[PDB]
Amino acid sequence: HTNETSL
Amino acid sequence: LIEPARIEEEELTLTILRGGLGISIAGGKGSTPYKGDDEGIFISRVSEEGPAARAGVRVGDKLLEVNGVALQGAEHHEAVEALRGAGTAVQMRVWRER
């Protein structure tokens, strides 16, 4: 887990 | 028998038309990196046949620019706010490597 943001 | 001519790296200006864009960005200055020690903003997921996949966005692309905002050496929330508006289109320059 390394800071992904959905867009 | 020999390897063909291949693109090692490039800088692409892409136009994405869109409710969502179809991308998941990862990384940024101050966040756990995505690739190696490069703390840039990268494309970590592309929705299947979404508007970004039609634009040519590839997984692993580095965000250099969005709508004129240079996202080089930027923080994660800096790119999110630059991509959350996206009234109808976003134009982003990306760095693709192989």
Q: Is A4's CB within 8 Å of B24's CB?
A: yes
Domain membership of residue B3 (yes or no) is no
Domain count, chain B: 1
Residues of B in contact with A6 (CB under 8 A): 20, 24, 45
Domain membership of residue B62 (yes or no) is yes
**Resolution of the coordinates, Å:** 2.6
**Residues B76, A3: contact at Cβ < 8 Å?**
yes
Interface of A with B (CB under 8 A): 2-7
- What residue numbers bound the domain in which B45 lies? 8-98
> Which technique?
X-ray
Chain breaks in chain B (C to N over 2.5 A) after: 18
Domain membership of residue B1 (yes or no) is no
Domain membership of residue B80 (yes or no) is yes
Domain membership of residue B2 (yes or no) is no
> Which residues sit opposite B95 in a β-bridge?
B11, B62
Which DSSP string corresponds to B7-50?
A: --EEEEEEEEE----SEEEEE-TTS--SBTTB-SEEEEEE-TT-
